[PDB]
Design a binder for this molecule. Structure first.
Ligand SMILES: N=C(N)c1ccc(/C=N/NC(=O)c2cccnc2)cc1
Ligand SMILES: [Ca+2]
Length: 223
């Protein structure tokens, strides 16, 4: 997260870190057994780390639980990043408490202008490289579909939205991939892509979660 702020330990209780020997992506806990992330985060040997603040220090609220299965969206295209969404099932159910909690799925899509909270452990620099140890947060508005398409001609599908600031300086970044965009207590987005980070006229692009609620629910119901 570039141009954000320190969230505060366990203030974003649905935020997970995906670990394969090191943090490599974020995710969102949606019930005791399931995490939503980006399909471009797919790999084998995932351990889900819940209750994290400093990802390099055991601070006392963590739950580390291996993934038992991952399900990439059937229509995910890794070239265009269309349908950039994946479900991960935990080998055992998380113990839910104030610091480890699920986030609600939307019942309707969010509109341009809605303020959302975007979070993760990704790069904090738009030029150089600096990875934080503690969870970073950014408050950002959803942008109109027209401004999103204008920023990225030929690249924005109906399964994507933009959020952030056309002026630049404030954005998600590499390492935030797969993490949450939460608006009025609903998971509306997943950190998906952008051109660099926090560049002028290049806002963050996010998977449009409201399009996938039916798929998420039916997948969970049979797996
Ligand atoms: N500006 C954003 N909101 C943004 C931009 C990019 C990304 C994702 N990056 N992933 C990578 O580059 C990458 C991925 C694999 C290997 N090497 C590099 C997320 C958000
Ligand atoms: Ca920790």
């Amino acid at each position: 997260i570039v141009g954000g702020y320190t969230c505060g330990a366990n203030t974003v209780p649905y935020q997970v870190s995906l670990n394969s020997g090191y943090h490599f992506c974020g995710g969102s806990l949606i019930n005791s057994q399931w995490v939503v992330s980006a399909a471009h985060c797919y790999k084998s040997g995932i351990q889900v780390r819940l209750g994290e603040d400093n990802i390099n220090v055991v601070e006392g609220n963590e739950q580390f639980i291996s993934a038992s299965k991952s399900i990439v969206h059937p229509s995910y295209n890794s070239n265009t990043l269309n349908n950039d969404i994946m479900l991960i099932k935990l080998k055992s159910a998380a113990s839910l408490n104030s610091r480890v909690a699920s986030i609600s799925l939307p019942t309707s899509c969010a509109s341009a202008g809605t303020q959302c909270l975007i979070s993760g452990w990704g790069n904090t620099k738009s030029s150089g490289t600096s990875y934080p140890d503690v969870l970073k947060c950014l408050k950002a508005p959803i942008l109109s579909d027209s401004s999103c398409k204008s920023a990225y001609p030929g690249q924005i599908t109906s399964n994507m939205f933009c959020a952030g600031y056309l002026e630049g300086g404030k954005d998600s970044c590499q390492g935030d991939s797969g993490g949450p965009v939460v608006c009025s207590g609903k998971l509306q987005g997943i950190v998906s892509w952008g051109s660099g980070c926090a560049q002028k006229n290049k806002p963050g692009v996010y998977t449009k979660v409201c399009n996938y609620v039916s798929w998420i629910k039916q997948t969970i119901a049979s797996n």
